Amino acid sequence: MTPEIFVELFKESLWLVLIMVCAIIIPSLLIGLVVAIFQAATSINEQTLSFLPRLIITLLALMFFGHWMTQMLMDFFYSMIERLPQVLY
Amino acid sequence: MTPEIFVELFKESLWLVLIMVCAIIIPSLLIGLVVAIFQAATSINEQTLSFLPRLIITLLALMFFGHWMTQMLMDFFYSMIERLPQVLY
Amino acid sequence: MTPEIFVELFKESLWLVLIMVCAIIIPSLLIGLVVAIFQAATSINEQTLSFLPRLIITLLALMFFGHWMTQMLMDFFYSMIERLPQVLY
Amino acid sequence: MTPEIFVELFKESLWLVLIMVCAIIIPSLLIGLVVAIFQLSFLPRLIITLLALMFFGHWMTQMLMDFFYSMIERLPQVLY
Amino acid sequence: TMLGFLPAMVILMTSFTRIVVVMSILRQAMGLQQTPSNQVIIGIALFLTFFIMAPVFNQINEQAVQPYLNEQISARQAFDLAQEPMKAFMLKQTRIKDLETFVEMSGSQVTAPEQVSMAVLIPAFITSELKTAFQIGFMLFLPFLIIDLVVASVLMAMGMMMLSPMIVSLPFKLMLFVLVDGWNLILSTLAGSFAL
Amino acid sequence: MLGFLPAMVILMTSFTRIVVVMSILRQAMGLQQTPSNQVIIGIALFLTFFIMAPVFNQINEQAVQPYLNEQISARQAFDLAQEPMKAFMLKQTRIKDLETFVEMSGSQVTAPEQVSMAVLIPAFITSELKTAFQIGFMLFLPFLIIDLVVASVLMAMGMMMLSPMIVSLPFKLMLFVLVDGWNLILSTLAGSFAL
Amino acid sequence: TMLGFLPAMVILMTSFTRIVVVMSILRQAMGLQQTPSNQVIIGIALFLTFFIMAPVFNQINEQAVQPYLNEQISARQAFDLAQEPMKAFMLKQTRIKDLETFVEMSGSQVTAPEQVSMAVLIPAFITSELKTAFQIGFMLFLPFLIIDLVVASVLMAMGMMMLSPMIVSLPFKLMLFVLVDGWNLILSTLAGSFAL
Amino acid sequence: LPAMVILMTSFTRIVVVMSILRQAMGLQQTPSNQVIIGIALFLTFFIMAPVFNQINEQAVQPYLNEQISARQAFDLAQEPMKAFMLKQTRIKDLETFVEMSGSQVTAPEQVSMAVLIPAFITSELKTAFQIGFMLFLPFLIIDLVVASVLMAMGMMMLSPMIVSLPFKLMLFVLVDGWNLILSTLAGSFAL
Amino acid sequence: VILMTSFTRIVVVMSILRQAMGLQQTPSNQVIIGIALFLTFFIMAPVFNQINEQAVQPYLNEQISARQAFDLAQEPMKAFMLKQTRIKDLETFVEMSGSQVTAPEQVSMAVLIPAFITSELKTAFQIGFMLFLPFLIIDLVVASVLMAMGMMMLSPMIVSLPFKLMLFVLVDGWNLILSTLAGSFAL
Amino acid sequence: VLDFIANYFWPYTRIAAMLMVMTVTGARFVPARVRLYLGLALTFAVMPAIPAVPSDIALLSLQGFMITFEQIVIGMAMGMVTQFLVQIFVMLGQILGMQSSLGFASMVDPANGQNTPLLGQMFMLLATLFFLSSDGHLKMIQLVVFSFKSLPIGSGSLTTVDYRELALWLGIMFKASLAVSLSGIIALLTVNLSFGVMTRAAPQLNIFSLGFSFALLVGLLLCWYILSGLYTHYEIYWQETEEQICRLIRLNCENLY
């Protein structure tokens, strides 16, 4: 019911978002990096070569982090529902 | 209804997406890569050279893998409904 | 209505795409190839040199093959309508 | 209404695109050719493109306005 | 309560929802934000239906409505007579394969299909329509997609990676659709798909 | 009260589940309101009369037949109609939602058949919509599989533009008709009930 | 029960559709996505249709509304009075091949296209208006597509690959639009298409 | 015109929370505004049951056995509905509307119903737009996550307001959603 | 009636600007309609003054009949619009309605309005071209700087939008264009 | 009998017209019956603080329609400012999104294309909460109350100089959205230049090699950072949008809330 408690409540959600997006992307980031390095090593200049492995790694990570992410977000939604009465008053 | 039956039901579709995509694309990646190897062996620096050869295979495979793909996805959609009553309750 | 009439009818559209695309594009590949060979023999490291003659070719082909292409695609649409009633029932 | 009146009407638009783009790019083409014969080559390649723009702009817009007007003219015969 | 849902049922008992879905799949197929009006779609479909169901409306008005001018009966004839012609109509379009499920799950298994309850045929008629509508769609859709694939490919061939191949490819689709007489063939096939 | 009775009485049925499911499907196909609201609220309205046939017949025999012959009405007939509705809905709600609402209402129950309608319904709707979303997600995924593969083959060739939501419509329609679509779907939506 | 459908008939009865369709194709042609321009399209086409049907609307007024002072009549030769001039008008803008592929579907053959059933001309009138409109659209579209191709091509040629040739083509699309005096010709051409 | 009475209740809050939810996950014109009006008209009968009981078993039936002035029934029923609101309205809203009324700042449980109504509805709207937006926020986490993951591999075009709707529904049902959302709205009323 | 006003031109200029920024639908078309509706009163105010003076007060002072007052009300509106329409464009439509007139003042309402709207759209585009000019210039110059660097991880539109903003507000932005939409209607 | 509605129509119209636009009530999520019965109830409450409407002005007469419009104008005007308020943050959101490359479909294609109002849709929640946490709507209603005593019924309306100042607000919105987001914008741009350096190192790295990864990350991170002290700027701009409404209904500011 305070302005600061709302902004705190939202920075929480943004932190959740950011950690999720890093968890998912950083594998894609590293795999794109290494495939680009392999490109520049032999001067193989191709644009969408690096779309197969990056997509593959993103799918594999979605398989991998499938449970931790949903558990995190569900915990967050639970905490949200816990905070409602104090928001009423 | 469980946080586990919906994670596994998820992993199924993710695995389908993975296998479909790789089956379609690996020929395209391979032909593009050999085109780039030929470019390097010929000092050729072209950007959209490896498009047509890559779309040729990306299409030929989609006709060669047509029935297998539509059968696999169809069978999946079928299994998405046999378990429908078990999950509704 | 059968899984094979819709996959073979689909092969037909994909075949159309393939033949139209290769008709329009192969000359562009030829001009791009010879331009890159020209650069390499002349030790010319230019990127968008090729685009002008290559665009010339693909815009010439759109007028060389125009009537044939719009005839092919029209006939295809016609065969689609013709075979529709044998698929509806 | 006939396929051929639509195919030719399209071929002419393509001819326009071709003759228009070349008038613009050929100077960049030639300057790039010479500078590469010497060999950076983009900022000059932009200068000369702007120069060709300011040079041939009146003729380009005139040609396109002519094409628009002719398009308008051959319309009622195609409608019916 | 039977005031705001009548427009959604009096149309659906008819062979109306097919042309709607067909023309609405086309309306997106053109690579083109709607541009007939939604009202245009509904109106061309409304008139196509008043045109197709003429054997049935000519029987509704003739056997039930005009007999209900002298009225000849206290509102009982039309409630019971208007049902058989529509049932005989839909039953020619309802697949038997789709009806088999809708009867065995209703329980009242009748040998004579025309003796099925109206509330069992209608839901069998709808699930049979949308299947036909989607078939006709996937038939009519493919050419407009061949154009788009070939256009996007030829564009990518020069490196024109950003040209948004949905502006440049609209003239080609509209050209093709004009060449083939378009609607004349289309709105005859839908008129011809209602084998009655 | 007339401004709500249409929405009040339609909710006692399984209308909402069919509505939400067909809506999720309509958006799964990516179709921008192609079967308009007057299409979906019509089809899901018909499937109600198809499903609620037993309940409706018992209503007519035990309420409308007594109302046309005027045995007793508007006091006893309304109550007699209240019964089979509870019989139907009560067989479809989960236990957990019902105990939740009955502990919330403060009035304690010993026989689940003996919840008042005003506490029965609000537990039915929550146990219906939850099933509706479960079904919807369970029907959705196969379509999503179609989108993400299409939306990846394009980028594999370089075609950043050309929204898959235009090139992946034919695949989805072919799939949907090959699996017979509205046959299997509308049967499970009709077989899910205990009625 | 017709509070939703009726609003769609009035625009189909008149030739409101063609202007909307062509100008909405043109709106996408400019690459200009505006719900504001989308809304004002209705206003433009609406007042154009006012100006166009001023002869027919004024004649219908003189035949019905001015007599509707004493009104002399009720709904028998008053409705069928107004039914006539609209049928005369639409008939001059439809094709004949379109109308004959429809009357054959109706089966109600008439020796006189003037004595044609209203419920088959309008379904033939719309397939004709849409075809004429798509023709006009493919006519008007080409110069803008040429602008787009030239723009993307020079951008790609100079090397600016990643730049989107859709945010920069719009100023030149407006230049070419105004240099041709814009709507003044276009609407004129549209008014030329409805040659009575 | 009578629909103010139902809107004097805890009706406008549930309507708003459900409307924020329907729009939280992609869905537009999914279950029609008529449907959510229905769900709210039911949750209100479930919540306000003690109030309607105070009304019925204390003023309604004795009015069918009238032995009283008809307006006395409203007078004795004007009080419990009042007492219900006074447990919900904020203090700031009440004092500010006492100011705005021009009447002197008098003790609570004493101000007329006419000042109570809008002070009640504005407090309800405040509570509702907060509850919903804190239930909204999670369903937006998923949207941002999936849109970012898309943009990661790219594809630039797959409208993330549908490719996320499966995740939204799965995650809304994994918490059972309604047995938490429709319950807390019933537990958010001490009366 | 809102079309008889200038709002038609105003909102089109608004949306032209919106898309120029590269920030699509960011000013919330509801808000755009609001601001454009408010300008219309800042533009039409002198006109509405005369509209009130001519018959409104006299009609309320019972100095003119109903239909006569209504006919008088359109006059200053016609005069105002006649200074915005173009000669050729008004000519096309007055001919296309057939019934020619000697004085443009004597042209009918329902036939001046259409020629008015197209004449307004044309000049609106004439304005909007000027509006796109600086923004397109900025996009081009930033893209060219990037290409001289040639880094390609730039996507000059997304890196150019901040420059579009820091160079719209830095030049006082809306105040200048507003002044043009005020000076554009030299009544 | 008791045709009272004729006595208080104008104040109700001003109230509800202010309401149909105000960022909380006149938004969506609230069916029109709610807002209508809210406005109609407010009048009964402020019935004391409303001067007698000028009699002799029948509603079913031109004289009445002129003033009724002359109040709808004021009502729309009061709310549209608050709309500008929340749209400041909406623009903050859409700038920081389209800079993160999150919203990208409409930046490459301003046409129909595809829009992603996600971050903007979130920041609108903030601005609709800040306007609610600090009870904006109460102050906004009190201003309408005072309006019946500063811009009374039948005595004038906004003047021409008022509209012009009001239509300047679009410039104010762009100025505010930059004053708030400058820190994050500059940082994101510097990081994009770091990208450009690392890519000039080798021309292999393209939009489909490491496309937008660091862009998405830093765009979200600096957005979370801006979130930290965001209430302060909202407080400042609330003062401007409050004095501005004070300018319309003159009201002699610096006297009360």
Numbering used by the authors:
A (entry chain G), B (entry chain H), C (entry chain I): 1 to 89
D (entry chain J): 1 to 39, 49 to 89
E (entry chain C), G (entry chain D): 104 to 299
F (entry chain B): 105 to 299
H (entry chain A): 109 to 299
I (entry chain E): 113 to 299
J (entry chain F): 8 to 264
Reproduce passages from the article.
Type-three secretion system (T3SS) are multi-megadalton protein complexes that are capable of bridging from the bacterial cytoplasm to the extracellular space. At the core of the secretion system is the highly conserved export apparatus (EA), which is made up of five predicted transmembrane (TM) proteins (SctR, SctS, SctT, SctU and SctV in the vT3SS; FliP, FliQ, FliR, FlhB and FlhA in the fT3SS). Here we present the structure of the TM region of FlhB bound to the FliPQR complex, in addition to the structures of the FliPQR complex from Vibrio mimicus and Pseudomonas savastanoi.
